[PDB]
Amino acid sequence: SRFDLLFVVTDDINEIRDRSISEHVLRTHRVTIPFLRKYVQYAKERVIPQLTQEAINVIVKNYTDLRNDDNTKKSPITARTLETLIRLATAHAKVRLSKTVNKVDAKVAANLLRFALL
Amino acid sequence: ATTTLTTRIPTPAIYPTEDTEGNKLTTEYGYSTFIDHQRITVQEMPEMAPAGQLPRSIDVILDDDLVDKTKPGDRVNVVGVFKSLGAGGMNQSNSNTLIGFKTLILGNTVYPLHAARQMLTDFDIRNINKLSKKKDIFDILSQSLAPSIYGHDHIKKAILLMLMGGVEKNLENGSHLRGDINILMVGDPSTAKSQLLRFVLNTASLAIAT
Amino acid sequence: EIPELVPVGEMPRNLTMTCDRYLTNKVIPGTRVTIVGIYSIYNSKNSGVAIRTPYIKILGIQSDVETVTMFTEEEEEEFLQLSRNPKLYEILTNSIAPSIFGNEDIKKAIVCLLMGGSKKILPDGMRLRGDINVLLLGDPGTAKSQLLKFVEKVSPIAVYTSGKGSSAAGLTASVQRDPMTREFYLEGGAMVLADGGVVCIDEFDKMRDEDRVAIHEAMEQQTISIAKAGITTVLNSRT
Amino acid sequence: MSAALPSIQLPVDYNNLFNEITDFLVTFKQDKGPKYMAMLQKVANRELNSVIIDLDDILQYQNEKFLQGTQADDLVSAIQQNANHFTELFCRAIDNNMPLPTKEIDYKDDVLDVILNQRRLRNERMLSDRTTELFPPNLTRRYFLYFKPLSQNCARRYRISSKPLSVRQIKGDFLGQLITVRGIITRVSDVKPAVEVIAYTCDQCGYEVFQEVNSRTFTPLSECTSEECSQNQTKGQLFMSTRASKFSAFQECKIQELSQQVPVGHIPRSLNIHVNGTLVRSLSPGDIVDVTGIFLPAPYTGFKALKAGLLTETYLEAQFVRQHKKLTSDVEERVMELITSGDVYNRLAKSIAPEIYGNLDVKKALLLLLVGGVDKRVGDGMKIRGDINVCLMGDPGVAKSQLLKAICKISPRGVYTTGKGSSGVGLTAAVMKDPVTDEMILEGGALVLADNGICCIDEFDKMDESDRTAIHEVMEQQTISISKAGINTTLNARTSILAAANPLYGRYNPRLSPLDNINLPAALLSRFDILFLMLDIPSRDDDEKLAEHVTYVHMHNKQPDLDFTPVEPSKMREYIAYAKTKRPVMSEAVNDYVVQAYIRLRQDSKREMDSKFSFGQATPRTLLGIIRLSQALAKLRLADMVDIDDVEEALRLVRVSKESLYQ
Numbered sequence A: 001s002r003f004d005l006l007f008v009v010t011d012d013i014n015e016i017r018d019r020s021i022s023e024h025v026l027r028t029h030r031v032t033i034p035f036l037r038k039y040v041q042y043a044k045e046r047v048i049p050q051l052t053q054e055a056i057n058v059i060v061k062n063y064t065d066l067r068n069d070d071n072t073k074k075s076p077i078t079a080r081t082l083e084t085l086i087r088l089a090t091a092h093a094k095v096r097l098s099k100t101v102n103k104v105d106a107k108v109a110a111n112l113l114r115f116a117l118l
Numbered sequence B: 001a002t003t004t005l006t007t008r009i010p011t012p013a014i015y016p017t018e019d020t021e022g023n024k025l026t027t028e029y030g031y032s033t034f035i036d037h038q039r040i041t042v043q044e045m046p047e048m049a050p051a052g053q054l055p056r057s058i059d060v061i062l063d064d065d066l067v068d069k070t071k072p073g074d075r076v077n078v079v080g081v082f083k084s085l086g087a088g089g090m091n092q093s094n095s096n097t098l099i100g101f102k103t104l105i106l107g108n109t110v111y112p113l114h115a116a117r118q119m120l121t122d123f124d125i126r127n128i129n130k131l132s133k134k135k136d137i138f139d140i141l142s143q144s145l146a147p148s149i150y151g152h153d154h155i156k157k158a159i160l161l162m163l164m165g166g167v168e169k170n171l172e173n174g175s176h177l178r179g180d181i182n183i184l185m186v187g188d189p190s191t192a193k194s195q196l197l198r199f200v201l202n203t204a205s206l207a208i209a210t
Numbered sequence C: 001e002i003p004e005l006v007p008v009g010e011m012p013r014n015l016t017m018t019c020d021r022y023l024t025n026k027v028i029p030g031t032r033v034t035i036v037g038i039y040s041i042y043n044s045k046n047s048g049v050a051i052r053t054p055y056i057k058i059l060g061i062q063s064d065v066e067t068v069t070m071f072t073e074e075e076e077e078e079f080l081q082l083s084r085n086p087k088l089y090e091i092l093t094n095s096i097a098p099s100i101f102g103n104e105d106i107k108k109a110i111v112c113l114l115m116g117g118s119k120k121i122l123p124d125g126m127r128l129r130g131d132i133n134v135l136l137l138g139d140p141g142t143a144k145s146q147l148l149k150f151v152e153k154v155s156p157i158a159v160y161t162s163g164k165g166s167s168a169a170g171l172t173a174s175v176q177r178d179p180m181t182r183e184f185y186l187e188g189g190a191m192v193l194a195d196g197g198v199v200c201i202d203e204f205d206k207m208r209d210e211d212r213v214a215i216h217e218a219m220e221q222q223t224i225s226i227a228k229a230g231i232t233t234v235l236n237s238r239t
Numbered sequence D: 001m002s003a004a005l006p007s008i009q010l011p012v013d014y015n016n017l018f019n020e021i022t023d024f025l026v027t028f029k030q031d032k033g034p035k036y037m038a039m040l041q042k043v044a045n046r047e048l049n050s051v052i053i054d055l056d057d058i059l060q061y062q063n064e065k066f067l068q069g070t071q072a073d074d075l076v077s078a079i080q081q082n083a084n085h086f087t088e089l090f091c092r093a094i095d096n097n098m099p100l101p102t103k104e105i106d107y108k109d110d111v112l113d114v115i116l117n118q119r120r121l122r123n124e125r126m127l128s129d130r131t132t133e134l135f136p137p138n139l140t141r142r143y144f145l146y147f148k149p150l151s152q153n154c155a156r157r158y159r160i161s162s163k164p165l166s167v168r169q170i171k172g173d174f175l176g177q178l179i180t181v182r183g184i185i186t187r188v189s190d191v192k193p194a195v196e197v198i199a200y201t202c203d204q205c206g207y208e209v210f211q212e213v214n215s216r217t218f219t220p221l222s223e224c225t226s227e228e229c230s231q232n233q234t235k236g237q238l239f240m241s242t243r244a245s246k247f248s249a250f251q252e253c254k255i256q257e258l259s260q261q262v263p264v265g266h267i268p269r270s271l272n273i274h275v276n277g278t279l280v281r282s283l284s285p286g287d288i289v290d291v292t293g294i295f296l297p298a299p300y301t302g303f304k305a306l307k308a309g310l311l312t313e314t315y316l317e318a319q320f321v322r323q324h325k326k327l328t329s330d331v332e333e334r335v336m337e338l339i340t341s342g343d344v345y346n347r348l349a350k351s352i353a354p355e356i357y358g359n360l361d362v363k364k365a366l367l368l369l370l371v372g373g374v375d376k377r378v379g380d381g382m383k384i385r386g387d388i389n390v391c392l393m394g395d396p397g398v399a400k401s402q403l404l405k406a407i408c409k410i411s412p413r414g415v416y417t418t419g420k421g422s423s424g425v426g427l428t429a430a431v432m433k434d435p436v437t438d439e440m441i442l443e444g445g446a447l448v449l450a451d452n453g454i455c456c457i458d459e460f461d462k463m464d465e466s467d468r469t470a471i472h473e474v475m476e477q478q479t480i481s482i483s484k485a486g487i488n489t490t491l492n493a494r495t496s497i498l499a500a501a502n503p504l505y506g507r508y509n510p511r512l513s514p515l516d517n518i519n520l521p522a523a524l525l526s527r528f529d530i531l532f533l534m535l536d537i538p539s540r541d542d543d544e545k546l547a548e549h550v551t552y553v554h555m556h557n558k559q560p561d562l563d564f565t566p567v568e569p570s571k572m573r574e575y576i577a578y579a580k581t582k583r584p585v586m587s588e589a590v591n592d593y594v595v596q597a598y599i600r601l602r603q604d605s606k607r608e609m610d611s612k613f614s615f616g617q618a619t620p621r622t623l624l625g626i627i628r629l630s631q632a633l634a635k636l637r638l639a640d641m642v643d644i645d646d647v648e649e650a651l652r653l654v655r656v657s658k659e660s661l662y663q
């Protein structure tokens, strides 16, 4: 209850899936890292938007339908899960490096939970 | 034993009274000068010491100029003089099997290293805005993270989403909420559940885990 | 004391010694050694009449091999003269165990286990694990036991803790109070002694307590860190 | 002496300041005559022993030295240079300008009055008894000194020494100065008499040898040192005296840091503070305060050669405390605001905890218990049960902890607890380890200190081996004790209990049997009165309203709405305290209406007899509890109307608390 994401890693067996695996481990016994560590540590020093009425209107609709679909299905979710649903999109705008909570961030936040739950 | 170089005749005294007069001595403490004193033990960087021993340690006395600079868990690099002190063999009699030569370092100028301070120029700060203009770079960063493993792009975006971090706005005269993010995994074995857990520590930006 | 020379019912004892700098750091723990020196006497004042203690003042360790790769040249001359004869793979299986009837599939698994593969620190963050680890399960009376003493003497570094786990939490690390300064530092381990080589254990049925929870981290990444009351350090392991 | 014993000639002397305190005579006429001399008169007549020599009377004194164009050195310079040197030249200036016989004390009405004059005349007549030792100045003071800095717009007038620096940046040249630091006071010791003067008597000459008091260890002298009882073949053998030795106050405390200005790294550390004069007995554990005071280090004088080379282990010495954040007595105007507006059952229900969604039934069930009241003055030895206890259960996701505990941190004397820490063995008091001072004290938990209040507990499945004893022993009246091998003494028990039990894994299955997740049958179905629940049913209209409920608090920062004027918690606290001072007595028609109520309570409970949903089999312990809450609600809403309608409010609550599971 104090955690949010319980990713259950599958290991299903498909003949194109494992064949693709078999060469890629083999090809490595013989976009960059230090740029990546700079980008995040620069993005810890930029301002935090939190504020757009448009993005908060769509996510609560996005909550209510699964609020009809959590209890008649797999896993009951709680009010603190909404504090995730702001927080993922809040950090997703931190990837954007902007001060406007857009619309596009609210689509990846819903879709990430949909695989996490289904 | 703080002048760092000259072994002078010590003054085994705390405070004198009654100089050669009949005057009760007074001391001005605003014009008396002070300094601090802090010892810290340094382990061994436990990757380049070859596998025949546990890590060893020595210690270093520094001064005011770089105190509180040393958080426990920093790749530090110090430089100073090598120095022995203490009487070994005479201060007690018969002195059998007692070292009396303590290793000390009375040094200067530590530096954190990285293998917090990374100053970048106008060039790279502009290019990172220039690639910020692309509307795909959230996806490129996901695929450019773990260069060994196929797929799991739902997992791969989550790690970079967690590592960068979401804020917590503290309530004024009220309890702040959870602004930390805390993800979890589980999986049937040998499916790279512990693979990606060890390379988050290399790019950790001063986040040393157990 | 080498644990073979005086058996009646006793437990072995121990001495102490010092040395000079141009013969120090020449030994690792876990080796056969021989030594020649004096038997003089010191007197520490930290027990009855004025009694002192024994210790050895050593002079020269004309040891056996280290068991840090410097040696002479005529050793490698015969080795290259043997390695050109391409019969090594079949001639070892007869010559490794001169006391073992056959068992050809098992015998080949041991020579590859002793030498190993490599280690990649390839230009990224992660790494591969270059090692192999075998098992032998089967009926009693099929020489899985006495084969294991045979790998111990032939290994460069080998330990033999093969029984009952021996308090599997205290297999890897131990901390205790100190006689001087009352401190918590790291002292003991079965793995840190045994790096570069091979351990050997048994009885993987009736240990359920901590033996499995102690080898899960110790294997597959070979990077432990003790989080007990003092330090949290990632000491290396290549077991 | 040679080898650099003399120093450089410093331009900053003291004689230039010595005469500048001589012109701290009657000259400051801006602030009925000389105002700091007016305070000098209200001490000599022996009613108050703390003068206050601020910086305001120095800066204005330097303000009207803007026109005298002569050399007047700076004052706040030197007193932040070496602050401790600015009290000894100060007292040697007051005595030339102190009007002594300004009071009138005849025989009594002064502590230590005839005897000090007996002592003074015994030394005054012995000043001329030859046909000699003057008083050290520490003997006749009966007063202290104090200081007080400034951090007002006078610092923004023209020019610092009183910015509230933290403990972290303080180790530099700030040693031997006057600095204020904020913090949190912990480790309060007691008040012990320290020594400042001495008197040895040898019972031969009666010449009391005086000495200055040094550090915490000192040594008495010999007996052949005096002027009369010495120098012969017989010397009076010295010993001490109590009543002729004036003794001061002393108390030690330790500070920490605010835990908000601490950096991301290291833990905060302590500091030592002392008291002198009469600022004593004015601090408390948990005071979010600040002290202003002067700085000095101290020697260690023990094992100084091998260890203790030149370590310093300083403290700071206190000067001023500026404490912060603290019944028909100019407060009756707000008691009338509840009487004129009325609105007991609903506006007060919206008053306490308006920060949730729905649930007006449970916010009403608690306010009646926040007033309590004496159950019945029994007189004879019939100690009746009082102070009923309500427990909750259910697993919402609305963070149930800050629902209940937020009530506790504003309700009176209601101490917070949890599962860890003060468990059911350390819920009462016990004996433990202490510092080098008086060990084996009776350290307590919660119930030995939160008597007659609120015991707001959480985490009921935690440390239950000691807790399950601990809950019965307070529900049982008056056996909070320490049945240890130290003592067998028993103290009182008068406190209400508010519990919240968490369910089993996932949700409590309502189709399954209850008591699948609470582990105490005997504590519940016979020794409590009412229950509730926080079950979650899917409902579309409420949750989107609940969605707007939680999202509204993020864009703004404020939460209030729904045409309710928010009420200050002091007002209802005064209303509770006034309601606790009524205690009405019931009539006869009320007990006539509950005997028919219990019969109708008896018959329907004796119809089900099933293990499907319901609990209880109509105990009189439930019957006496419904009398308890009625007079409680008759206490808060006292219009002297103990009747059928008042108890009709009561059974109105027992029917809605029950069957919360039937949805």
Ligand SMILES: Nc1ncnc2c1ncn2[C@@H]1O[C@H](COP(=O)(O)OP(=O)(O)OP(=O)(O)O)[C@@H](O)[C@H]1O
Pocket (backbone or CB within 6 Å): A021, A025, B148, B149, B150, B188, B189, B190, B191, B192, B193, B194, B195, B196, C127, C128, C220
């Ligand atoms: N799903 C996968 N895709 C690609 N490579 C994999 C995968 N799983 C394992 N590997 C390969 O196997 C090696 C080791 O995997 P690893 O030991 O991390 O499994 P694990 O996550 O530790 O599982 P467990 O914790 O159950 O032991 C890696 O070098 C990796 O290349």
Ligand SMILES: Nc1ncnc2c1ncn2[C@@H]1O[C@H](COP(=O)(O)OP(=O)(O)OP(=O)(O)O)[C@@H](O)[C@H]1O
Pocket (backbone or CB within 6 Å): C099, C100, C101, C102, C103, C138, C139, C140, C141, C142, C143, C144, C145, C146
């Ligand atoms: N294949 C074999 N070749 C030669 N000797 C063998 C072989 N198998 C068993 N032995 C002999 O068995 C003797 C005693 O071994 P032992 O009976 O202790 O085996 P064991 O430990 O009972 O087998 P297990 O480990 O399966 O219980 C040894 O002297 C060994 O020489």
